[PDB]
Amino acid sequence: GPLERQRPLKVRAKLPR
Amino acid sequence: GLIVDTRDVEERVHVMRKTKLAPTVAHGVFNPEFGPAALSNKDPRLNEGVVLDEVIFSKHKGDTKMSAEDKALFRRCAADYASRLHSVLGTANAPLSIYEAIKGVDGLDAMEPDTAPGLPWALQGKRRGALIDFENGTVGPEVEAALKLMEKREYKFACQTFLKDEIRPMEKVRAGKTRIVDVLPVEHILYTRMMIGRFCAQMHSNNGPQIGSAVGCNPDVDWQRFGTHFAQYRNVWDVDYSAFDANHCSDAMNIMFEEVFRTEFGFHPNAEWILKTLVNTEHAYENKRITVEGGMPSGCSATSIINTILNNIYVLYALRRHYEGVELDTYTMISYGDDIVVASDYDLDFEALKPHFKSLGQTITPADKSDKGFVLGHSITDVTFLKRHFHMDYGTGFYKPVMASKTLEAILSFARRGTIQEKLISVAGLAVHSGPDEYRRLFEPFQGLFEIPSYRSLYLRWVNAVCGDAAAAK
Amino acid sequence: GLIVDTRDVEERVHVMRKTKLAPTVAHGVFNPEFGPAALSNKDPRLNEGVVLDEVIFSKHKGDTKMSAEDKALFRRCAADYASRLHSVLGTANAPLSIYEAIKGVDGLDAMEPDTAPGLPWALQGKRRGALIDFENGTVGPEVEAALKLMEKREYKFACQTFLKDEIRPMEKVRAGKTRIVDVLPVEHILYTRMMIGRFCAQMHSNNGPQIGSAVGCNPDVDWQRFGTHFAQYRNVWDVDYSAFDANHCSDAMNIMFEEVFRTEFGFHPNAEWILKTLVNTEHAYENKRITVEGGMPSGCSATSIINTILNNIYVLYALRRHYEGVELDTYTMISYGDDIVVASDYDLDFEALKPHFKSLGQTITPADKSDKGFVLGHSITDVTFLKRHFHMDYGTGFYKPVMASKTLEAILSFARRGTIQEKLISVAGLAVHSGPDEYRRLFEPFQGLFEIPSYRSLYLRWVNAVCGD
């Protein structure tokens, strides 16, 4: 499907609290 | 758009400074947080610091000069949308005759015989009927002379600025957020209809998600068609724009006109030209002549159609600016001017599209105020389109267009003197979809004072209309 | 690991094997769902279709290939953990002498004089005493020659596979899931201790959450230290691995050895080499020779330390593969081989880490089997480490290690023949932490047959041990 133009090849989550 | 000049002139273009919208019997019952827009700078309801004459033009905040990259992306998006449009409609876009342009054709209403004629006729004390024969569909010498100048691309004109006399939320009234109608010369409207009238007729007749346009739809019948379509998608979004019409940049307007209204798609060469006359406009308000670059004048012949086309191209542009591999089948949408419903089975990030719309000079926000940010998982039953929700009718299983009770109260609370009976029958057609209890409550203030159509009569009329449309399709 | 070859050989190892474990009078009272592992294929407790000599090696299901990107991430995680480890321990990692390696040093016990010597010595009817003088700390010509081959990196060897005579869950017993221990040649153990002996001594001395290792800890005294540390964090997790040792992939083992045992950290260059001999191994079991690529041989020198180091790197790797901005300060942990407690003030999504550990060939689940999923807001008083909970002792205000009563019942239900009195006194040291009522109940079966230490005497002994530390 559609993939973002400006995303890197590190699709990693942010740390929660 | 960008105001590039404001000068004073001799001949004053006068403005209506008194509302014709008087309170009805309903006003005292509903006490609506709505009222007539301020038409005078001296209106005592205006908040401290509000200058009406300034606020009404404050929407003109500039004309976004798009980058080389963005104009190239926009042009290919306009061409892709045009390809879809002309594939569905065909390319029989030959000009309407003068007669057809005045009288209308299948899918295009006749011109109005006694609405404002625009300038310079308003200053000469001339009505539309003195310039055009609306019964026989012929033009007088003044209009014929102007049509000759348009053929030769030498026609010049001014837009006449009218304040719109209408009911608004009181927060907007007090803020001086009175809306403007730009009245163009009757001959300009006539020639626009000659150039693109057939195309507009085809757009109306073929309204739906395939062409992304609801212009010319009948909400009573078409809510079932639109609702059933959007119900099938994982994600639905309703998008709010800030001053949509004013914020169309010259680059976007010019490129759209160039890609959609081409001679190779069967248009007269002056289709592109007459639309391009809308980009750089002179606006007459009292003694002021205001020159504006960019923006669609609010109320030209094809304003709704032009706004709808731009809305479709804006969505394709924004998605393609953010994402790789976006095509017309990545999403579905329907638009009526600035109003839009988008849907997709993909989890499209509409929050992330905000800066991409900004590159066109457009500011998008969620139509829903549960959050200032866009979210996934909304359905067709969450969105507002043409001020109407999509509700499933219990009696039929058909989608019906439901308006907010507070809005229906506001519409019923004001009327021009001698129009209340007519207005009640009109609003009855809107209110039936709120169901029998709400219908009764909304019209109770008028009981024994005016004819109120029975709930049942309007409900049966509606069921028959949707069923008739389905029986036709079979 | 991958079993790359299995072949029959005439120089066989063992004879017909029977358990040294017998039930005690406690077995009939507690009826534990535990029993001695099967040591024979003819054990009548074994399910239909069980081939014992196959099931014992069934953990070897392949050697997981890691992507170039995952190898690069793993090397950074190995380097980052090594940095912390050598910062705490220092770089005093010079090789031990033959004498020091046999005799041990401060923090490293002497080598065992009369344990299994390994191959080929076992087949030649040689004991360790025939090869090494343990009293004088010298080696005969056989070991001297082998040491010279290791100096030249030409030394080759087989691991001698023994079944573990021990209590197992009855489900595991019937399935033929007897655990194995690999006896490496005594000279290989010797040279390993020469190469990394000072390091292992420093690991034992500095055990704690800062190096993420409990190897060399004393639960009686150290539960206070560990408990106080983990009590400070919002979230605590205990993690279960499936066949941790077997599923260390060659990629992970080689990178870990390369980053932790670098000459720049004070190691002899053969520290990396002797450790890398553990990756591709030959295992001798009766008449079978099995060649395995990947996995740790269970029972080589420094098995516990190596498994602990890998556990530390695995957690940093898995968190960094899932999350942005993960450093050693993002969490705390302590490990003893496959056993692990992790904690963080961050609401880390351990369920989401499952596929990241799978990239290492490792399968993680919650240690608490009352749910197959990880949750937030568990505390140090909820988790199990080395089969012990962390309970606050009312009398002292010190954490004490409390074993589950079902664990203590299973332990008390079996003993090696003639060892019951010795075992009861040992187990009493574990059971005291369960409190007086449970202590009394656990030893009731033995009253009048054996001397049972009073709860009171073992409690006061414990108070002295923790107040002394």
Author numbering:
A (entry chain C): 5 to 21
B (entry chain A): 1 to 474
C (entry chain B): 1 to 469
Provide text from the study.
The best diffracting crystals were those of the 3DpolHis-3B1 complex grown in the presence of UTP and Mn2+. These crystals, orthorhombic P212121, contained two 3Dpol molecules in the asymmetric unit and diffracted at 1.7 Å resolution. The quality of the electron density for the 3B1 molecule in the P212121 crystals allowed to interpret with confidence the 3B1 amino acids from G5 to R21. In the structure of the 3DpolHis-3B1 complex, 3B1 molecule binds the bottom of the palms of two confronted 3Dpol molecules (named 3DpolI and 3DpolII), in an almost equivalent way. The 3B1 binding region in both molecules consists in a hydrophobic cavity formed by residues: from H322 to V326, T330 and from Y346 to L348. These cavities are occupied by two hydrophobic residues (G5 and P6; region I) and (L19 and P20, region II) located at the N- and C-terminus of 3B1, respectively. In region I these interactions involve the main and side chains of the 3B1 residue R9 and the main chain oxygens of residues R320 and E324 in 3DpolI. In region II, an equivalent interaction is established between the 3Dpol II main chain residues H322 and E324 and the main and side chains of R16 in 3B1. Region II also shows an additional polar contact involving the side chain of residue R21 in 3B1 and the main chain carboxyl oxygen of D345 in 3Dpol, slightly increasing the interaction surface (508.2Å) at this binding site. Furthermore, the two 3Dpol molecules linked by 3B1, interact with each other through contacts mediated by residues from G125 to P141 in the fingers sub-domain, forming long fibers along a diagonal in the ab plane in the crystal packing.
